[PDB]
Amino acid sequence: VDHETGVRTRPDNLTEPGFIKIFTQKYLGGGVVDSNAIKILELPQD
Amino acid sequence: STGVPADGGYTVIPELNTEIMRMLTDESTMRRICTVKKISSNEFKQLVSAGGATVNHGEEGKTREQTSTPQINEVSIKLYPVYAYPRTTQEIVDFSDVDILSWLTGEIGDTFTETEESDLVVGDGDKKAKGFLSVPRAEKNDKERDFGTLQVIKPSESLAWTSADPLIDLKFALRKKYRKNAVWVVNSTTAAKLQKVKNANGDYIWRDRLQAGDPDTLLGLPVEYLEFMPDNVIALGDFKRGYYIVDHETGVRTRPDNLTEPGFIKIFTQKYLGGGVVDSNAIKILELPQD
Amino acid sequence: TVNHGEEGKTREQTSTPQINEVSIKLYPVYAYPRTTQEIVDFSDVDIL
């Protein structure tokens, strides 16, 4: 799941002067919908 | 009358001169006497050839022997952030006729000139411009002395403030190469002490030998005074060659930073100042005992 | 003032410079000589 805005990069160069804090943000989400569609296999690792 | 506020006294408004008088303004003598190299880097490397190139004065019919290849020295002048971060209230910046933004930028630029005359002279070099005085000194001639160190003359208190001998020594410690376009660098208090030197007889040595149109000189060379020098310390040299003031290519960069804390606008106006001794043979230092 | 900040150091607050007021008040400097109209009329050197 993504947001309509997506990746947004705001280069805050004011709050801490002498610095650019490049605040890059992306709203990300993930969920297992219909778990019957996915299967897992843990190897014995010897 | 205007004396009584009620009797037409409130009508008279005081005409505030919209150009604030910046008391501490001065044309930066450092930036004029020394060269200014706008650069885009943290460190500026000027190559300063020490010398050592020789000739053997060959004869007609003699094998031409190898001559010594001249040497080069590195002067690593690193730029550092000299800044001021005043937090003016947004109230004044709005409620004003004298423009506080421009006035404060001018005041901080004058402060930058003052701290240039401080760092480029006395500045130890701890994350700032290394002044020529903070540069280690050595009482040796140009041939014997190590590069990156300035020739310092340290006479006794007897002939220091009694005669012109220390200053003549300082003048001719420089080579003609530098004395052509040399300049003196004295503190105002040290300058006053110099103008007061009187020999055993009592007459002044420097007998104010100037005309009205003459700039203040000393032993036939101009004297650009620096106020941040320590007491009883003198310098002299071709500071165009002798010292490099390495400013960054951006220069003064005044972002007002209005969003960090609303109700306050915080002019940052940081600059990147660097400074270093270049041609350590082009500057001479004269230490005089404290009276 | 400036604090001569380093590479990787928080930039501390510097003192904001001060301003002073010089209130120069204007006052009437005058002279009120009472010349006779006689001289002002009877003259070649312009008395006014």
Automatic annotation (TrEMBL), chain C:
Compartment list: Virion
Domain of life: Bacteria
Designated name of the protein: Major head protein
